[PDB]
């Protein structure tokens, strides 16, 4: 009766497809007449409490609707699994390496805006996402991109900024704006910080040696343990910043730049960054 309820009978695992750390996403084959014919999905599960996060991020993603958000489909039932959308091409961790030739700057331009798009209507709704990375974008093809995961997206209080930050022992340190690395602040501006960062893995195709922890641990030093942090503040106070990839024009760097202003209320909007990539692929 009931199209987004899954049993857990007919769900069956075929692969891993990727963890956060409290978190994994699974492939799996919802096969409920037994031949091997059913649909495959995307199967988040948690690792054996965070119960209520999962619950959260489920009640959160049900309710977003857009073209460059992954697609909700249901749940598996204490115990609880979000059941999504799968998107064969994977991440752009996994896609761009592999399809360097296919993927020219005017379709990198392209799957920019796209994201521009996802997190304008995310913060449209007063969540903020605060986990932007390559890793969760997924290809659902040339085309079109779709943002993947929202495993730490928090709404922010009406008539307030920003949603203040508790647990942040597993915090993507490179992808943050220094509000967040020094009050543990989170504003719809620190999502625009970290979009910078995703927009210079997406320019160098997500290589592992130009990514934002690579170069940022060349910078300041990769052997300083817990005072990492501290040097990467230090770093981004002295106006430090990733240089431009190879092959990046410099009015595309300078988007870039804009996303990197220390003072928050400084940095670019999604919806100026959408003109400005707009323009440059008229
Ligand atoms: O096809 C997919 N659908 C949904 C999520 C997803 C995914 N999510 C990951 C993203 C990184 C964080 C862990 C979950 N990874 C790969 N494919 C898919």
């Known amino acids: 009766v009931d199209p987004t309820h899954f049993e857990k009978r007919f769900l069956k695992r075929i692969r891993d497809l990727?963890?956060?750390?409290?978190?994994?996403v699974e492939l799996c084959?919802?096969?409920?007449?037994?031949?091997?014919?059913?649909?495959?999905v995307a199967?988040?599960?948690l690792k054996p409490n965070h119960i209520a996060d999962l619950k959260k991020e489920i009640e959160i993603l049900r309710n977003?609707?857009?073209?460059?958000?992954?697609?909700?489909?249901?749940?598996?039932?204490?115990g609880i699994k979000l059941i999504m959308e799968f998107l064969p091409s994977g991440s752009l961790k996994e896609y761009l390496p592999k399809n360097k030739n296919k993927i020219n700057?005017?379709?990198?331009?392209?799957?920019?805006v796209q994201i521009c798009k996802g997190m304008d209507y995310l913060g449209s709704r007063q969540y903020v996402h605060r986990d932007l990375a390559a890793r969760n974008v997924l290809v659902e093809s040339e085309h079109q991109v779709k943002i993947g995961d929202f495993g730490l997206t928090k709404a922010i209080e009406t008539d307030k900024e920003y949603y203040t930050v508790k647990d942040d022992r597993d915090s993507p340190v490179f992808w943050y704006a220094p509000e967040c690395l020094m009050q543990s602040k989170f504003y719809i501006a620190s999502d625009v910080w970290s979009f910078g960062v995703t927009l210079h893995e997406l320019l160098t195709y997500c290589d592992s040696d130009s990514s934002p922890m690579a170069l940022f641990l060349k910078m300041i030093?990769?052997?300083?343990?817990?005072?990492?942090?501290?040097?990467?503040?230090?770093?981004?106070?002295?106006?430090?910043?990733?240089?431009?990839?190879?092959?990046?024009?410099?009015?595309?760097?300078?988007?870039?730049?804009?996303?990197?202003?220390?003072?928050?209320?400084?940095?670019?909007?999604?919806?100026?960054l959408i003109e400005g990539f707009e323009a440059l692929l008229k």
């Open 29 to 40: 084959r919802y096969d409920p007449e037994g031949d091997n014919t059913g649909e495959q």
């Open 18 to 24: 990727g963890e956060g750390h409290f978190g994994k």
């Open 221 to 272: 030093g990769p052997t300083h343990g817990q005072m990492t942090v501290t040097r990467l503040v230090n770093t981004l106070k002295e106006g430090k910043r990733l240089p431009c990839p190879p092959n990046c024009p410099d009015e595309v760097y300078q988007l870039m730049r804009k996303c990197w202003e220390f003072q928050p209320s400084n940095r670019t909007s999604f919806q100026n």
């Open 64 to 78: 977003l609707y857009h073209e460059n958000i992954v697609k909700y489909k249901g749940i598996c039932t204490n």
């Open 105 to 112: 700057l005017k379709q990198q331009l392209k799957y920019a």
């Open 43 to 45: 199967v988040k599960s």
